[PDB]
């Protein structure tokens, strides 16, 4: 059968693997830390000037819809670093295998009901380095490039270098009793 993260509603954790064999608590977390060059994802300077310009990040973490704190300053981002975490009851081996099999997390920069761009954050990459979970948290931290949903990207003026929209993300897996530090 397919390894699936099964919400236990009353308890507020997700069971991964058979509940009698997979009984340890883990925390899986996503942190959006900073961003730059986001203005490339908005075609019109005038949209930045409107106050309806309220931007936030969205992603689905094991089937949970997560939105971040809205911010207005797209050209000079001022959102605070923000973490969302889920609790998982599983075993080391089963959870590591489960994460290695998950599709990438897709984090979207949104305005209202529109996605302006998204980036792929590998959970399998995190599983691959989750090799000492009895003793330490495992973290993948990187600057991820946001891609607009359009077919053609136009750049004016075209320069030799290409500073692109970037989102700093950290994804972490740890045993619940192992402090992040």
Residue numbers in the entry: 166 to 346
Quoted passage from the original study:
Using X-ray crystallography, we show that the ciliopathy-associated centriolar protein CEP120 contains three C2 domains. CEP120, for example, plays a key role in the duplication, elongation, and maturation of centrioles, which in principle could impact the production of a functional basal body (Comartin et al., 2013, Lin et al., 2013, Mahjoub et al., 2010, Wu et al., 2014). All three C2 domains of CEP120 (C2A, C2B, and C2C) adopt the PLC δ1-like topology II and are structurally similar to each other (root-mean-square deviation [RMSD], 2.4–2.6 Å), with major differences found mainly in their loop length. Thus, the CEP120 C2 domains probably play a role as protein-protein interaction modules.
For the O.n.-A200P mutant (equivalent to the H.s.-A199P JATD mutation), we obtained diffraction-quality crystals that allowed a successful structure determination to a resolution of 2.1 Å. To obtain this crystal form, we introduced an additional mutation (G307S) that we found serendipitously. Residue G307 is solvent exposed and is not strictly conserved. Furthermore, the crystal structure of O.n. CEP120 C2B G307S did not reveal significant structural differences when compared to the corresponding wild-type (WT) structure (RMSD, 0.19 Å with 181 aligned residue pairs).
